[PDB]
PDB file of C-alpha atoms in Angstrom:
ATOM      1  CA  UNK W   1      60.217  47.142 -46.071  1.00  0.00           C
ATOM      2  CA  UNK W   2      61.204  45.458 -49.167  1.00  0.00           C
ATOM      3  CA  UNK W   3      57.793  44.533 -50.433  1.00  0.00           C
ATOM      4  CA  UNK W   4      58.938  41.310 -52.468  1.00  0.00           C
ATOM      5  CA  UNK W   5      59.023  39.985 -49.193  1.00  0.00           C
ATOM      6  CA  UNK W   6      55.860  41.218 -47.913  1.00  0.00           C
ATOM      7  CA  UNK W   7      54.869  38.898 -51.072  1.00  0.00           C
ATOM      8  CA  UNK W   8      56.515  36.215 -49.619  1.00  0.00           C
ATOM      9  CA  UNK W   9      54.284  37.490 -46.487  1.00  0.00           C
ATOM     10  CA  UNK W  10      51.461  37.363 -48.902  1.00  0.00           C
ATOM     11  CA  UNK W  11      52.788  33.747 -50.151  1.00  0.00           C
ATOM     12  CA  UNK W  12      53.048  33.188 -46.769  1.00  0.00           C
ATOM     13  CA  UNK W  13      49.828  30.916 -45.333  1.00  0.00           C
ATOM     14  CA  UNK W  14      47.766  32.516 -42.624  1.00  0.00           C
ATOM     15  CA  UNK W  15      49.153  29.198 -40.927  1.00  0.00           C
ATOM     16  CA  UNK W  16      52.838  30.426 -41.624  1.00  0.00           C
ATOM     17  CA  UNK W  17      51.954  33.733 -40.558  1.00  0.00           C
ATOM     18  CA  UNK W  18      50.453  32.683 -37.664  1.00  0.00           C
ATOM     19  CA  UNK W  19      53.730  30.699 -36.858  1.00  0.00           C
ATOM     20  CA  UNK W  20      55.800  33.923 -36.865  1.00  0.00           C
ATOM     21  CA  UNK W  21      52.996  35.608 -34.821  1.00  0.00           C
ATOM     22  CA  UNK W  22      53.470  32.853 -32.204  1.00  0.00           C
ATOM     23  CA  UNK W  23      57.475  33.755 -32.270  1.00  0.00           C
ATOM     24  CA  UNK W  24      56.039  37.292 -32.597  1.00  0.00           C
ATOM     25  CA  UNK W  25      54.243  36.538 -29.388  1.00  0.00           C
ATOM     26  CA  UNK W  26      57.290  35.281 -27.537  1.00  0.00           C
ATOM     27  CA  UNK W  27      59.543  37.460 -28.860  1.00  0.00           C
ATOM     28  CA  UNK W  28      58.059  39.889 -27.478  1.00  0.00           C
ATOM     29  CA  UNK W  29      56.778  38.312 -24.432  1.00  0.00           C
ATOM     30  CA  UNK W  30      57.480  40.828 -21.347  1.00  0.00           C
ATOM     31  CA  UNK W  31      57.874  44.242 -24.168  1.00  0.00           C
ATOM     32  CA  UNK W  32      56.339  47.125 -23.088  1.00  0.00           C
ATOM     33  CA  UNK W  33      55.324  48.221 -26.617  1.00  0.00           C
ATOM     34  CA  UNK W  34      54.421  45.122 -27.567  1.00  0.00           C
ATOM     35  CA  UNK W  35      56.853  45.009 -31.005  1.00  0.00           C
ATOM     36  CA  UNK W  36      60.251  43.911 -31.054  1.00  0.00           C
ATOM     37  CA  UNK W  37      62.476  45.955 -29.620  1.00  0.00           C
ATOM     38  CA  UNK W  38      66.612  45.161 -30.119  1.00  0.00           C
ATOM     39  CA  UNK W  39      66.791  44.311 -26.272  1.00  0.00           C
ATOM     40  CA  UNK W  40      63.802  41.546 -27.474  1.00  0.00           C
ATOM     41  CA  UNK W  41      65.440  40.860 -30.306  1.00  0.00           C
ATOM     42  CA  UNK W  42      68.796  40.442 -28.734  1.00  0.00           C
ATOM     43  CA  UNK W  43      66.564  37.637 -26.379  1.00  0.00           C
ATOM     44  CA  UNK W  44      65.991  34.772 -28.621  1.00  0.00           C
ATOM     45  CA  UNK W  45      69.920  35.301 -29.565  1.00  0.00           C
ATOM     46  CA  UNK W  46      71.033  34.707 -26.440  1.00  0.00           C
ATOM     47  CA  UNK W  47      68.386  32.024 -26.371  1.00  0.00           C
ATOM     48  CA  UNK W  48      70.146  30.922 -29.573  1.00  0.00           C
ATOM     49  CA  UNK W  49      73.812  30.655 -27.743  1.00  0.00           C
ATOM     50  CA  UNK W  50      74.498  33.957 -29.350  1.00  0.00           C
ATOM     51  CA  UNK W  51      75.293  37.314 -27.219  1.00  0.00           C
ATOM     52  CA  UNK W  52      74.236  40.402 -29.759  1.00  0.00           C
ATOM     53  CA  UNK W  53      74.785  43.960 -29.125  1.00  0.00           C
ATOM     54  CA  UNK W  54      71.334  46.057 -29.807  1.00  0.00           C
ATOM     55  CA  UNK W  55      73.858  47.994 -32.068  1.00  0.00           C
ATOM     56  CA  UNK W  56      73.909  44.664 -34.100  1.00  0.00           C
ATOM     57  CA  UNK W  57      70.217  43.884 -33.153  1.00  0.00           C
ATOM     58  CA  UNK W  58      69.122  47.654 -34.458  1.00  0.00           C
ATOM     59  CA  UNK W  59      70.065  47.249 -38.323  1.00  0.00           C
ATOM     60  CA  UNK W  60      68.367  43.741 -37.728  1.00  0.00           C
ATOM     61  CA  UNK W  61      65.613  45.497 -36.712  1.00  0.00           C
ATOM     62  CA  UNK W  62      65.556  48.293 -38.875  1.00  0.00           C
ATOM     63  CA  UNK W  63      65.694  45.752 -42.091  1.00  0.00           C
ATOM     64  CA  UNK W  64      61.891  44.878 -41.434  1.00  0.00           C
ATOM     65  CA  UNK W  65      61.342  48.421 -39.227  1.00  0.00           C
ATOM     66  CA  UNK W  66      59.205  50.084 -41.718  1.00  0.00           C
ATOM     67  CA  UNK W  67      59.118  53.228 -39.641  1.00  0.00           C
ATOM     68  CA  UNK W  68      62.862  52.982 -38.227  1.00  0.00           C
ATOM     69  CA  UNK W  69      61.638  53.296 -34.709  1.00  0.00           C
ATOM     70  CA  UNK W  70      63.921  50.595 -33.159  1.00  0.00           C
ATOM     71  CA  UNK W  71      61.475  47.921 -33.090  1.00  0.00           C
ATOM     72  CA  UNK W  72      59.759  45.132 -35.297  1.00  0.00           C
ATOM     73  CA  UNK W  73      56.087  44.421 -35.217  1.00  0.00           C
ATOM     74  CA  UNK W  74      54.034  41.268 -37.076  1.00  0.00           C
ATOM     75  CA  UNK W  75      54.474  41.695 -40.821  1.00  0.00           C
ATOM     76  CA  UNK W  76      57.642  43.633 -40.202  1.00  0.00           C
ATOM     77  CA  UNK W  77      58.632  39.890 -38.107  1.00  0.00           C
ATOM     78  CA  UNK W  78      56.579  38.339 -41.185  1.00  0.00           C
ATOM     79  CA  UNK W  79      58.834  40.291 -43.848  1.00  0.00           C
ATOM     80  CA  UNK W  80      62.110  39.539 -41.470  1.00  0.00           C
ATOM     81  CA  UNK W  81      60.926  36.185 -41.169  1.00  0.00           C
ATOM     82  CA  UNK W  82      60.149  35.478 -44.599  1.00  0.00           C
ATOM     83  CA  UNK W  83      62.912  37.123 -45.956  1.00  0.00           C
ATOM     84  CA  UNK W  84      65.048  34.119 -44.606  1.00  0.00           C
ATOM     85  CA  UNK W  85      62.457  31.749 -46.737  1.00  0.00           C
ATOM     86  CA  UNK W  86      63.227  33.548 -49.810  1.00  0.00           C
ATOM     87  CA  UNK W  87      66.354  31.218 -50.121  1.00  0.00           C
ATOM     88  CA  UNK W  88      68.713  29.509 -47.564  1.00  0.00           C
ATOM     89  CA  UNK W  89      69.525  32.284 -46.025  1.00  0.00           C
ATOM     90  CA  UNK W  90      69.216  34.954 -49.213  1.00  0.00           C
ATOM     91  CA  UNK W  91      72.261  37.049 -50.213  1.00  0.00           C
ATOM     92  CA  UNK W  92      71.712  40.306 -51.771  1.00  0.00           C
ATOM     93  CA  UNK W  93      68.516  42.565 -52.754  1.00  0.00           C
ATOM     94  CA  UNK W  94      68.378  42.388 -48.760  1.00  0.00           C
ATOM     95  CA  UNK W  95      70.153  43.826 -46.112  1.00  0.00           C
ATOM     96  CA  UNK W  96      73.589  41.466 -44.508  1.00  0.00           C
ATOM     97  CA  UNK W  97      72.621  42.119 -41.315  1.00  0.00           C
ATOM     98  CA  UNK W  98      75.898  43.746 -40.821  1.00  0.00           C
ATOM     99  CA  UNK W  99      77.887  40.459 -40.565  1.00  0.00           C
ATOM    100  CA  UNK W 100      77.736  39.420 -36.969  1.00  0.00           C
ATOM    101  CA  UNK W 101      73.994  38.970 -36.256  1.00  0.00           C
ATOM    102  CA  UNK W 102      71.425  36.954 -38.156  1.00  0.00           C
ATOM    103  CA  UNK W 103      68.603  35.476 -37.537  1.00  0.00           C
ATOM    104  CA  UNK W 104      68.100  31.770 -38.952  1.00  0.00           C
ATOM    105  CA  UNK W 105      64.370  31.708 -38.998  1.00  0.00           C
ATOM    106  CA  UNK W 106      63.820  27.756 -38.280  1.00  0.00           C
ATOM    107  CA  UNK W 107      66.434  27.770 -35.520  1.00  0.00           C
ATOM    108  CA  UNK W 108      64.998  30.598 -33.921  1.00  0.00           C
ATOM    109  CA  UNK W 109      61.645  29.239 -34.004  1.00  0.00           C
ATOM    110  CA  UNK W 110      63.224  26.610 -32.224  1.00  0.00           C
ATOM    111  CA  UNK W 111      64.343  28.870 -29.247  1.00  0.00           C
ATOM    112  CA  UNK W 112      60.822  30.940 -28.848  1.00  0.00           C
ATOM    113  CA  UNK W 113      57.908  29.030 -30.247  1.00  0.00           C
ATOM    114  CA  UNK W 114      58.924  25.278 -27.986  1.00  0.00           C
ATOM    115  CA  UNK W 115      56.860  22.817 -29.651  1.00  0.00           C
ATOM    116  CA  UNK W 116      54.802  24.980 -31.999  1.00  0.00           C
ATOM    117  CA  UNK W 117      57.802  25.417 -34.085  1.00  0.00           C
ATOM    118  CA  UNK W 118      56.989  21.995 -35.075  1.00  0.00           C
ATOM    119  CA  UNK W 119      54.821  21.959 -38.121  1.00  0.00           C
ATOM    120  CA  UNK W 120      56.199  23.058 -41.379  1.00  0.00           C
TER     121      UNK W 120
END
């Protein structure tokens, strides 16, 4: 985990936090360990109109995976999250995500949270 980020976790609010933990929540609503695995991640894509392969979903994953286990819990999601925040979409000092896959943070909110995405 690329700890500038978790900085940006610590810049984020307990509010904005909170907001990711709400996607969190979702994003992992119906996972069996409870953090993001690339088969949940892969689920707000396809929410999104895309169709990622957990190949694709895995580096995602593993970005914010501070343990490399294959799935994403709340301030790895916060640091994934965040890292979006940083700029646009930020370029380098961060993983590209391979090229295919990427998660744009606001429109995903958009396809988990319903509503509650609504705020900032």
């Amino acid at each position: 985990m690329d700890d500038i980020y978790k900085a940006a976790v610590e810049q984020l609010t307990e509010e904005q936090k909170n907001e990711f933990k709400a996607a969190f929540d979702i994003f992992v609503l119906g996972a069996e360990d409870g953090s993001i695995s690339t088969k949940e991640l892969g689920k707000v894509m396809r929410m999104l109109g895309q169709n990622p392969t957990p190949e694709e979903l895995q580096e995602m994953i593993d970005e914010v995976d501070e343990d490399g286990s294959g799935t994403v819990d709340f301030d790895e999601f916060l640091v994934m999250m965040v890292r979006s925040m940083k700029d646009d979409s930020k370029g380098k000092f961060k993983r590209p995500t391979l090229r295919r896959v990427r998660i744009s943070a606001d429109a995903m909110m958009q396809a988990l949270l319903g509503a509650r995405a609504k705020g900032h």
